[PDB]
Amino acid sequence: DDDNTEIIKSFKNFILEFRLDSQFIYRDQLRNNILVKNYSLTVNMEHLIGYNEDIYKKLSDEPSDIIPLFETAITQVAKRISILSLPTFQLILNSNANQIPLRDLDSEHVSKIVRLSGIIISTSVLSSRATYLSIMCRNCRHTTSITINNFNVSLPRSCLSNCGPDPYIIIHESSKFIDQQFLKLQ
Amino acid sequence: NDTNNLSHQEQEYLKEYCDLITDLKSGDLVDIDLSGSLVPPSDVFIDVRVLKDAGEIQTEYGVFNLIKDSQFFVRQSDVERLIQQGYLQKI
Amino acid sequence: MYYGISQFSEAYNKILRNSSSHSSCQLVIFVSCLNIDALCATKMLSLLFKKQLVQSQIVPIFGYSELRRHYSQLDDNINSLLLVGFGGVIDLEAFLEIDPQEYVIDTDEKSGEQSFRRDIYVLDAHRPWNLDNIFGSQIIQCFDDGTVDDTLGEQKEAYYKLLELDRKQRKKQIHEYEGVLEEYYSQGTTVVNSISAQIYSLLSAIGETNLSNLWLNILGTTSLDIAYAQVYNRLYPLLQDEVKRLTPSSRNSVKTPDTLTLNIQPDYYLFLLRHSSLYDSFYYSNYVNAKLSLWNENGKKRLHKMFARMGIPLSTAQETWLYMDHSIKRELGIIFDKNLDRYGLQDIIRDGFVRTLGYRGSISASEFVEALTALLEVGNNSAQKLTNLRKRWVSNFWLSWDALDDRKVELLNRGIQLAQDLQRAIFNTGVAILEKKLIKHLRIYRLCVLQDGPDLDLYRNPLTLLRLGNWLIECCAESEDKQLLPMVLASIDENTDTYLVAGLTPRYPRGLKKPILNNFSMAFQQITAETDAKVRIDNFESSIIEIRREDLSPFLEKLTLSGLL
Amino acid sequence: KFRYMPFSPAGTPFGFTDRRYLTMNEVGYVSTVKNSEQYSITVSFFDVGRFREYHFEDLFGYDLCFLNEKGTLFGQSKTGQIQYRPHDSIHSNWTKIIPLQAGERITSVAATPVRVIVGTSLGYFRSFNQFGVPFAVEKTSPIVALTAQNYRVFSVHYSQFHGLSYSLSELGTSSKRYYKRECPLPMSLPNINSDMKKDANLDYYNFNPMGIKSLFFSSYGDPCIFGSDNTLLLLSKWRSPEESKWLPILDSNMEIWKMSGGKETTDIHVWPLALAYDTLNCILVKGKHIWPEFPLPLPSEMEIRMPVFVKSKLLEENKEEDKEIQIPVSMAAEEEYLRSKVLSELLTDTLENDGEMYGNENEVLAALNGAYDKALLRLFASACSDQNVEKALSLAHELKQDRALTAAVKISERAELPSLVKKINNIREARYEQQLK
Amino acid sequence: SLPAHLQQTFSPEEIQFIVENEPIKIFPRITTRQTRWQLITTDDKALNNMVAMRSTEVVLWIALLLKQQSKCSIVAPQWLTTKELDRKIQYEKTHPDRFSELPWNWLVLARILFNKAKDDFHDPIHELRGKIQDLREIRQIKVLKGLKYLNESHLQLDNLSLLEINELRPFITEIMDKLREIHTASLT
Numbered sequence A: 001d002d003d004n005t006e007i008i009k010s011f012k013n014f015i016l017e018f019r020l021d022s023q024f025i026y027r028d029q030l031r032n033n034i035l036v037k038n039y040s041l042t043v044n045m046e047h048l049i050g051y052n053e054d055i056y057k058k059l060s061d062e063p064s065d066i067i068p069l070f071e072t073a074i075t076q077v078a079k080r081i082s083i084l085s086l087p088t089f090q091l092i093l094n095s096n097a098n099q100i101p102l103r104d105l106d107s108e109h110v111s112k113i114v115r116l117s118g119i120i121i122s123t124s125v126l127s128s129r130a131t132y133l134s135i136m137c138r139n140c141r142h143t144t145s146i147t148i149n150n151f152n153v154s155l156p157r158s159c160l161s162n163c164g165p166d167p168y169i170i171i172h173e174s175s176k177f178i179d180q181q182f183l184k185l186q
Numbered sequence B: 001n002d003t004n005n006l007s008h009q010e011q012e013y014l015k016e017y018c019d020l021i022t023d024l025k026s027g028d029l030v031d032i033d034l035s036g037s038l039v040p041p042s043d044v045f046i047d048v049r050v051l052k053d054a055g056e057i058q059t060e061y062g063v064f065n066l067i068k069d070s071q072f073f074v075r076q077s078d079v080e081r082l083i084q085q086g087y088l089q090k091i
Numbered sequence C: 001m002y003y004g005i006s007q008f009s010e011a012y013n014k015i016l017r018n019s020s021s022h023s024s025c026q027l028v029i030f031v032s033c034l035n036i037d038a039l040c041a042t043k044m045l046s047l048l049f050k051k052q053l054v055q056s057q058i059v060p061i062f063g064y065s066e067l068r069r070h071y072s073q074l075d076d077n078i079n080s081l082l083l084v085g086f087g088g089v090i091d092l093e094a095f096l097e098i099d100p101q102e103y104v105i106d107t108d109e110k111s112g113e114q115s116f117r118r119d120i121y122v123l124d125a126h127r128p129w130n131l132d133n134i135f136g137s138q139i140i141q142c143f144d145d146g147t148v149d150d151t152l153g154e155q156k157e158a159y160y161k162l163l164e165l166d167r168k169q170r171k172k173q174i175h176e177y178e179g180v181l182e183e184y185y186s187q188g189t190t191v192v193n194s195i196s197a198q199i200y201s202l203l204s205a206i207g208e209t210n211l212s213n214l215w216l217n218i219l220g221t222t223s224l225d226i227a228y229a230q231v232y233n234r235l236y237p238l239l240q241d242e243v244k245r246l247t248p249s250s251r252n253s254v255k256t257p258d259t260l261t262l263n264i265q266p267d268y269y270l271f272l273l274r275h276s277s278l279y280d281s282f283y284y285s286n287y288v289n290a291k292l293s294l295w296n297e298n299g300k301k302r303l304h305k306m307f308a309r310m311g312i313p314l315s316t317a318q319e320t321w322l323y324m325d326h327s328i329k330r331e332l333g334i335i336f337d338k339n340l341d342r343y344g345l346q347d348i349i350r351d352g353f354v355r356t357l358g359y360r361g362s363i364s365a366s367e368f369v370e371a372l373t374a375l376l377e378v379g380n381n382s383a384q385k386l387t388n389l390r391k392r393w394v395s396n397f398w399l400s401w402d403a404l405d406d407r408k409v410e411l412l413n414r415g416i417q418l419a420q421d422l423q424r425a426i427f428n429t430g431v432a433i434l435e436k437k438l439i440k441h442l443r444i445y446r447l448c449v450l451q452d453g454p455d456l457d458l459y460r461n462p463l464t465l466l467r468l469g470n471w472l473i474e475c476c477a478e479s480e481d482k483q484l485l486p487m488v489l490a491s492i493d494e495n496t497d498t499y500l501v502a503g504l505t506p507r508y509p510r511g512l513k514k515p516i517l518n519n520f521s522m523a524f525q526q527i528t529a530e531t532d533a534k535v536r537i538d539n540f541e542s543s544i545i546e547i548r549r550e551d552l553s554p555f556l557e558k559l560t561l562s563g564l565l
Numbered sequence D: 001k002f003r004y005m006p007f008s009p010a011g012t013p014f015g016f017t018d019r020r021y022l023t024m025n026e027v028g029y030v031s032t033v034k035n036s037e038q039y040s041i042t043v044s045f046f047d048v049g050r051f052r053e054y055h056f057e058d059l060f061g062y063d064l065c066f067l068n069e070k071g072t073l074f075g076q077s078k079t080g081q082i083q084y085r086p087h088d089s090i091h092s093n094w095t096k097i098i099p100l101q102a103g104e105r106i107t108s109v110a111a112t113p114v115r116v117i118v119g120t121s122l123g124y125f126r127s128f129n130q131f132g133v134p135f136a137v138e139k140t141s142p143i144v145a146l147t148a149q150n151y152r153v154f155s156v157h158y159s160q161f162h163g164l165s166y167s168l169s170e171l172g173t174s175s176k177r178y179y180k181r182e183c184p185l186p187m188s189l190p191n192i193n194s195d196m197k198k199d200a201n202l203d204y205y206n207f208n209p210m211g212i213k214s215l216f217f218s219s220y221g222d223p224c225i226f227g228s229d230n231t232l233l234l235l236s237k238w239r240s241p242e243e244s245k246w247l248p249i250l251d252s253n254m255e256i257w258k259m260s261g262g263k264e265t266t267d268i269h270v271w272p273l274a275l276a277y278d279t280l281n282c283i284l285v286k287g288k289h290i291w292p293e294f295p296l297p298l299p300s301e302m303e304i305r306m307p308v309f310v311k312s313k314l315l316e317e318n319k320e321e322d323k324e325i326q327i328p329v330s331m332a333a334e335e336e337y338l339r340s341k342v343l344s345e346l347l348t349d350t351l352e353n354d355g356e357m358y359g360n361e362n363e364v365l366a367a368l369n370g371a372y373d374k375a376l377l378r379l380f381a382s383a384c385s386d387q388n389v390e391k392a393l394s395l396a397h398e399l400k401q402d403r404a405l406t407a408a409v410k411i412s413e414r415a416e417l418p419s420l421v422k423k424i425n426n427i428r429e430a431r432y433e434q435q436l437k
Numbered sequence E: 001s002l003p004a005h006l007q008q009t010f011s012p013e014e015i016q017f018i019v020e021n022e023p024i025k026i027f028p029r030i031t032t033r034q035t036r037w038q039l040i041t042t043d044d045k046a047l048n049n050m051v052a053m054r055s056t057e058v059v060l061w062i063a064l065l066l067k068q069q070s071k072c073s074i075v076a077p078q079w080l081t082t083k084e085l086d087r088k089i090q091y092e093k094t095h096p097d098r099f100s101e102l103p104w105n106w107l108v109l110a111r112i113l114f115n116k117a118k119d120d121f122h123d124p125i126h127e128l129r130g131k132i133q134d135l136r137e138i139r140q141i142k143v144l145k146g147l148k149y150l151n152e153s154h155l156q157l158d159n160l161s162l163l164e165i166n167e168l169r170p171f172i173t174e175i176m177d178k179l180r181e182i183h184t185a186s187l188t
């Protein structure tokens, strides 16, 4: 339970303190992005490694679990530098690690950060995914909500307020969504 | 205080205005260089590197030998005009 | 004139007094380009005089040809001039048209000391000196490591007695002193000490010591380790004391974006370890190639075999060293203790200096000097082309100079990127020389000549040629136990139709007692004095010469016929 | 229990480290670092214009050091080895080794422009000229501290069997003169706190078992010392033995208490350096260890003030959270009048005997007299407002200038005290007659 | 005649020049008290009567000129300390419209002293550099709220620094002028 708070605290203190010479480059970037209504941050791996190698080690071992924690840390900083409401911010990464040729990817690489290159050959249309979502309970007519995030979920079955075996339905009239797209790399 | 694009009335106008500027710059108030720099003086001493081979030249403070890609440690109040003319860089 | 360590302060006081006036540029520095130690020294001096508000000019110089030109044009109110990194071996009063009577201001009636309107100061550890410079030449003022006073009694005596002397007794005496001086002259070159080191002692004397100065000291010193290992080894302990002295209290505190540190820790004779990859660090190391014969597959397979036994997966050994896994990074210091012995490769382990500033990551002095050197080499009818080339090489001085500043790390990274390509191109020529067996094994010395190559232009610069020579010398030093021989290396140019020639010494292996001396100087000199051939001698390092295409073979024929080799 | 140890003015222990300060004064300070079996020493100056900072190596492990603006003196307490170094190059340094009995050790050393002095645990005193020629040997109480300023020298001595004591002397080249010889010293001891508290500062008491934090002569040659209670003491009227007396002139703890808003910031410590007229030069040290470290932090300046206040009363008077406590005007005026009086007397004694150094100090004395009457007028007016004619009249005697007495008449008129107007004018007439005489 | 970028405003160089004329407290390492300085735009007595390690007050440009060399040390202003900056941040958070009462030159002086005099502070410099940033960010929030009250008549500002005003000058004055033109045109 406490580990989720220590990790968030660590990335929060990263953004608030990384100077190179005399400019707090991530505080300035995060402020300048909000003014043009861009809710994201472009972190660079080499700076993270320079600041504290342990954080990069945690990120390198379990990326599916740790990327959401760093994203919520960005939101917590974004409020302090601009409010005396905002969505959850998108984390974006840059790296210079060795490229893997696309033909060499195999079972040794599952759930690892990978850098590669190629040619885009196809693009899908946009489609909608849910982030904040509201729920109605069919029997008692009680209501609640859930927060999805898009890393590797289904509707729950613990009924509340007997209340039945599978009583939950979605209120699309009070829920939030985001864009998603598919691509093919050759 | 080159000419082909100016109309002839403009060609004499420019000469007239140059005469006026040098008249103001001369006489009383001569102690302040009205055509000099407008940026406040930051430092007395600077390091300047030699960009063009103008050879040996004279200036009110003294004589310089502009050996290409040599470097000077000198007071700015002297070399300000040579920086403006483009023989020197501040590095 | 010469001064001792106990009297450097006095020259400094004299200079401050003599170059006082603000009306004129009363102080001039002449510095040899294409030398690192000279560069660093000059840097140090510049900072000192900066603090002292001494108006001055810095001029880089290529060689003797340029030296005369630059000296010629000097104004009379130039009360003081410094010669950095050259000149100790030659009579300066002979080299220039010096009449002392054109420069004495005042003769001190009491001392007999003549005060001159233009004073010339010299810094160089090349030996032996031209004796007049020490003894006769009053305007000339050079610094010595007590070497002159300690050694030269018979020679000093010989010089003065020979000068004073100007029938059986007279004949015997003259013959005697002729002998003495003849014995002293014409001995192989050697270079005994670091320029920057001497200046650091002066800074010590004044009280100007700081980490910015000490790091320059280390940098300058470090440049010697490749070629004059003995020197480096003599100097080294002093550096440890200084680093331990000036490092602050409360050590091993938490980082800050402002925290700077300098510390002693392991370093490896591996080519740029903390950049590129671990595998490339071994593969391009100048020492490893001599120890495992990497020019052929029976050598390369030994390297693969080593990493397999060390327990490092070969696909991770090729990853960029910054991104390589943390566990391997911290276990590497123990893995080498268990495995290098089986490959006869234990000499890889040593201690060195590492510096870091804030959050931007560590670098060692050994890596820094390679970056500097690379920037020197590759930074961006016949007489005009020569002129253009020589002028281009001087701009790289400033492209190097500006990289000594912590505010300009951007330029240093470019230097490192160039260093990697230079070593790659050197290795790809060395393998061709060995596999085609272009080394000719003459009885007295080893000869090698490059008639063609993938791009032979890279060897037109002296420094690059020296790097290739240094590669071949390690290979020749380890390939057989027998026959430590001199080596000659040459490269043609299609624009001049001239061969650029270098004469190279042997050397003893790293792990093993007087030093040897480079004798090519006298040899080259004597054949040049004799020969019909069209040749050039103007370089500070006399071991390097140039000659036209058709004249190489008669020159080398006369050279091998000579007994001076 | 007590044990003898070496000392030098305001040194530091090694602590956990391989380096320390040997001593400090107004001119500069000395530091050293240990390098396996050898030591490196560094000498620093605040007058960077006048002097050059320098360094050298010691193989012998000196543990004693003394500085003046002519040179530096170094010693080894166990081996008896000593060395003196002039600041100039011209007079080359010289060394000597001094005899010692079994278990005897040197406790302190000091030097004038022409005299060299050494003291030991067994109470032996030895003296030499600036070229090591011996002059005399004497047997006294064991010495624990020494200091000098030109020809004036100030010494401290302690024994189980003779108590704590001090001496004052002047090594005039015309003649040597003693003003006090091992007379009793009223200094506050630290032993009770060291025996009871177990504060983990025991290393400092091992390093300095006397707990005498520092001692030096003023900028006008007055003898001064800083106690283990963190109080500054000065010896007044030393020229007159029936009038000589010790004066407490500043309590550091009381200042930090007020500065903190009446709070107990025991994490803060004061390290004294030198006394410049009315102002202390000092380092403000924070954290575990009550002494400074490297690189040297910048100094601070602080004025002396008389001990008159009370914490509880000032808290009651006072009653943003750290705001320094507000004080009654009566206390402020009283403290000023006492401080003005003491300062004027000390300055007067200095001028009476040694004259002006610079040609303007009389003007400061005039300013002090003005401040003195001004403070008394405020106190007088308070007494008049209270209608205490007796106390107001007693205060009026202490005013100097008739300007102030005229103001006192106006104050009495505002107080509507014609009796006091009358009696002040009687005093003014009497003092005018005394001025006419 | 005059450059286009100097028609209505001061450049940051001129702002630095203006700030440099203020007095500052120093400790000299040499004694000048018994040539003499003979200045014409300032007092001359203080520099002629210096005594080593005796505190004195001089103009800032001469103070930086001395600190260039060994001869001087600069005392930091009392507001430039961790305790005071903590209190000012708390004031800023407590009063969501008022500006805290920092001196008119706080940004300029902080960014001069951190470069020229990094060695003479008592607090650790890497904390001061953080607290200065916190103050500037909070003040920028308060500025962005205020630009919704540009009007035809006037505005009041308090404790806003010189550099902060100069940053905003060409925007506020221009938009306010055009609102004035639109309004008065309807009256006429």
Ligand SMILES: [Zn+2]
Pocket (backbone or CB within 6 Å): A137, A139, A140, A141, A142, A159, A160, A161, A163
């Ligand atoms: Zn329910």
